[PDB]
Structure 1
Amino acid sequence: DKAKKLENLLKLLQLNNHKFWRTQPVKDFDEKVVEEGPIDKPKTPEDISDKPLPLLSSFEWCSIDVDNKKQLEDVFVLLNENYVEDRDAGFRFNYTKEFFNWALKSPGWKKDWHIGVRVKETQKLVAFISAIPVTLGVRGKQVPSVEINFLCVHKQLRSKRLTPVLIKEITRRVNKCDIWHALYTAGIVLPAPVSTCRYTHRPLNWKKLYEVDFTGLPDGHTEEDMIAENALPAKTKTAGLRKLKKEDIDQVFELFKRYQSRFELIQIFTKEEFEHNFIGEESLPLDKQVIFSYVVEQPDGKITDFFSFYSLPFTILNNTKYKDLGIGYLYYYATDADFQFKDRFDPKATKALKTRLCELIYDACILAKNANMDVFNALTSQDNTLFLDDLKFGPGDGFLNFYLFNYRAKPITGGLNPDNSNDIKRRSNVGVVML
């Protein structure tokens, strides 16, 4: 009743170009957090069933092996054909097998949790729902959990109220393994964001981006002025910048730990799931390479800085010139630039971190460009708000809502000022980066 009013103002907020959750362990819109913790009363793996939920006649569940060749393919057919909301938008997600070999083969992954739904006779995958187990860090407290991603239902049967059962099953499949919480992120407004960030875009090939109608021409600007505006150099600028390597880890894992700890919602990385996350499947041609990791090694051997980014390209339709779009997304980064200071928000410690973040992420743009990326993405999350405006990361209209399943939390800052502008003042406290 009051929660509906708040939902509207929040939806009104994000506006641009509940029979299920009404019975789920989530924060409601009105609810002011008294104490951070579990919603649902403490349950046990035996209090939770072992029956995969029955679904409408003609369907069945299916576990999907990422090691299996044709199983993985089914997914990145259905996702590619259906993930794009509009069928006429003239672009599609192109999830490649190399991509899911990274994102679905998580250390601690179990093919049982890469749930799917098939049609009985035809063996046609019509829905997929993934979950990969991680340990979170909600304001100082260590919450062992799981990340739910890649929810998707076949165009031809939406409004079929199947997503509930898809969430309800993964709920059960996780629940029986001694895990009862989750991080999950959506673009649409659901009952109880802990935070919201905003998508932003950095041209790398503006000439192209225009010719595909992903960016336009502002009032009183030549097609030329814009080319000259976003133009980048060929070589990365900052001293001793190198690709991440097996040996770097223990120095980087410390650097990333010390840095990441400032945020209120981080993933606790175990040195092994960190290594799986930042070193990609070895030997892959430049157009297949999923993850891109980089690190600064001082002359002595000290690793000062670290950044990484992942490629998820679109396929482009109805365009003679171009067949697809190279899309890099900024990921997890680190730097010691503000370590000597006591306070993160000390104006001198902020200017010290900033001018570093400008350099490192400027060099990221060069590198992404060099890997044949057209547009480099980054949210208003983390300390990102420091460089975005300076590095021509013009605003995008996308809003990412971060939600926690079965855990109360007071609003974590997202890097947005109430008027949707970038919050240069307080930055952001969101530490995790979802896909």
Structure 2
Amino acid sequence: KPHKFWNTQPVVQNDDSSSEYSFGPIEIEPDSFRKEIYKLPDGFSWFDCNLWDIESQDFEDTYQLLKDHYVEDDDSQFRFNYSKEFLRWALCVPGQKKNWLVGVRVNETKKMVGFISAIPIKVRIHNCIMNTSVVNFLCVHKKLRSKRLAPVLIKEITRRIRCEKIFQSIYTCGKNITKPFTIGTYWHRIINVKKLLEAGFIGIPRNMTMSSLIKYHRIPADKRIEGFRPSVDSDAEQICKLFENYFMKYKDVSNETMNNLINYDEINHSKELGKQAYMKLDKIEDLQDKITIHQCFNVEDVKHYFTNIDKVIVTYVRENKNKEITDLFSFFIIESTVINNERFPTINIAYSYFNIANTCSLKELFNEMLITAKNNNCDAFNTLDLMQNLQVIQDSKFIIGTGRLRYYVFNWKIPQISPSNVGIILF
């Protein structure tokens, strides 16, 4: 069946017949976009969600909405239970705008029935760099589904983002909407066998028991790598350089292009000037084993994202004798509710974030990270096949998950690429 909203938006459609590998914006309309607030059905209202005071009623309403109505696995066995501390870390980022956190409320009862958010980030896409957005936590109350409310919330957040002179966005989905520029596969490393076995996540193969299963999913500790410790704020500048060196090494453009990236923020104000971001690629094979699109981090961003908050985010670095940082691993933590058992204990899952292995192999780095995940009472460690993570997944004890993660970019052209070419991690 055909789209009724997405067929009208500047994104590559599923039937695109482009005969060329091209990068660049799809449309350049700095002045023609709608600026008036969108209208909601009678008895509903917009509000800027107050996630700036963790004790606010807005925060309680948002937490409850997402706990009961946000993302479930494709088999409706588990639902995400984002904590307030996680949402604050994930949405109150540097440069965030108070009106990029959009809620929908029933006027008569003050019940919050909808939500959508965006955060600002910096990205490199091939030979361009820009300030862009990431849309996440789109949620509509279950009883209001299939009433064309989601396009309204999308149009609304788009208006608010464009009013900040930002005209692209990145967003992920478990299903196919339009054409995604890549599809990521996630994998599970079992840590707490007993918990996951009783939660219904894993079974028992023939001729095995929980004991032999615990023994098999054991995390090895016979070749530890010394020098890893939690990051602190004073590591920020060196973690910033560690990422820059990492993205410089895996770049998919020449050294000359990397030093003269096209700053789209300076040419998106004009239709003629913005076309300088058009870039044709003659050989898609030139991107093999390289990163084509990735987030960029300054020191203020590093301080926020690559910190340590109990039950939210974990970041470790490896040092040498001189206190210089040479490796980094990180994962964030989200609780998952068991849908058919409201009394089941807490299930905490770890999610691979950004990881840089220079003084050890990536498999060696992930083992240290798995040990640290065990120390943080995480029942499983989830990883996507992004960047170089395939090195850890192949010939391992990782188990394939049931779904796949589609990656989209709003108002930008990206040819279909491998997930290994992508350095973008959504929350």
Alignment TM-score > 0.5, same fold: yes
Are residues 116 and 235 of structure 1, via their aligned partners in 2, closer, same or farther at CA, if it must alter by over 3 Å? farther
Are residues 51 and 379 of structure 1, via their aligned partners in 2, closer, same or farther at CA, if it must alter by over 3 Å? same
2:6 to 21, 41, 50: 21
Paired AA for residue 400 in structure 1? L
Give the aligned partner of residue 297 of structure 2: 269
Query: How much does 1:294 deviate?
Result: 0.2
Paired AA for residue 423 in structure 2? G
User: Residue 254 in 1 paired to residue 241 in 2?
Assistant: yes
Alignment: residue pair count: 382
Larger RCO: 1 or 2 (CA < 8 Å, sep 6+):
2
Query: How much does 1:43 deviate?
Result: 2.0
In the alignment, the residues of structure 1 paired with residue 151 and residue 295 of structure 2 have an alpha-carbon distance, to the nearest angstrom, of 26
User: Residue 399 in 1 paired to residue 391 in 2?
Assistant: no
Query: How much does 1:97 deviate?
Result: 1.1
2:193–2:210: 8 Å Cα contact kept in structure 1? no
Are residues 88 and 216 of structure 1, via their aligned partners in 2, closer, same or farther at CA, if it must alter by over 3 Å? closer
In the alignment, the residues of structure 1 paired with residue 152 and residue 223 of structure 2 have an alpha-carbon distance, to the nearest angstrom, of 49
Structure 2: where are the runs of 5+ without partners? 251-290
Are residues 320 and 434 of structure 1, via their aligned partners in 2, closer, same or farther at CA, if it must alter by over 3 Å? closer
In the alignment, the residues of structure 2 paired with residue 199 and residue 255 of structure 1 have an alpha-carbon distance, to the nearest angstrom, of 26
Give the aligned partner of residue 416 of structure 2: 411
Give the aligned partner of residue 81 of structure 1: 68
Paired AA for residue 372 in structure 2? L
Are residues 88 and 377 of structure 1, via their aligned partners in 2, closer, same or farther at CA, if it must alter by over 3 Å? closer
Are residues 187 and 317 of structure 1, via their aligned partners in 2, closer, same or farther at CA, if it must alter by over 3 Å? closer
Are residues 431 and 77 of structure 1, via their aligned partners in 2, closer, same or farther at CA, if it must alter by over 3 Å? same
Query: How much does 1:229 deviate?
Result: 0.5
Paired AA for residue 152 in structure 1? C
Give the aligned partner of residue 423 of structure 2: 431
Alignment of 1:231-250 (within 5 A): 231-232=218-219, 237-250=224-237
In the alignment, the residues of structure 1 paired with residue 74 and residue 414 of structure 2 have an alpha-carbon distance, to the nearest angstrom, of 37
User: Residue 39 in 1 paired to residue 26 in 2?
Assistant: yes
Give the aligned partner of residue 312 of structure 1: 334
Paired AA for residue 322 in structure 2? D
Are residues 91 and 192 of structure 1, via their aligned partners in 2, closer, same or farther at CA, if it must alter by over 3 Å? closer
In the alignment, the residues of structure 2 paired with residue 233 and residue 413 of structure 1 have an alpha-carbon distance, to the nearest angstrom, of 31
Give the aligned partner of residue 126 of structure 1: 113
TM-score by length of 1: 0.83
Give the aligned partner of residue 7 of structure 1: none
CA displacement 1:364-389 (0-9 Å, x = unmatched): 11111111110100001110000113
Q: Aligned to 1:334, what secondary structure does the other structure show? A: coil
Give the aligned partner of residue 194 of structure 1: 181
TM-score by length of 2: 0.84
2:73–2:79: 8 Å Cα contact kept in structure 1? no
Identical amino acids, percent of aligned pairs: 40
Q: Aligned to 2:25, what secondary structure does the other structure show? A: coil
Give the aligned partner of residue 350 of structure 1: none
User: Residue 386 in 1 paired to residue 387 in 2?
Assistant: no
Query: How much does 1:234 deviate?
Result: 7.0
In the alignment, the residues of structure 1 paired with residue 334 and residue 223 of structure 2 have an alpha-carbon distance, to the nearest angstrom, of 22
Alignment of 1:32-181 (within 5 A): 32=18, 33-40=20-27, 42-44=28-30, 46-68=31-53, 69-85=56-72, 89=76, 91-181=78-168
Paired AA for residue 306 in structure 1? L
Are residues 237 and 153 of structure 1, via their aligned partners in 2, closer, same or farther at CA, if it must alter by over 3 Å? same
Alignment of 1:234-383 (within 5 A): 237-261=224-248, 262=250, 263-280=291-308, 286=310, 289-316=311-338, 318-319=340-341, 322-337=344-359, 356-383=361-388
Are residues 181 and 84 of structure 1, via their aligned partners in 2, closer, same or farther at CA, if it must alter by over 3 Å? closer
In the alignment, the residues of structure 2 paired with residue 184 and residue 118 of structure 1 have an alpha-carbon distance, to the nearest angstrom, of 24
Query: How much does 1:275 deviate?
Result: 1.2
Query: How much does 1:208 deviate?
Result: 1.6
Structure 1: where are the runs of 5+ without partners? 5-17, 338-354, 415-427
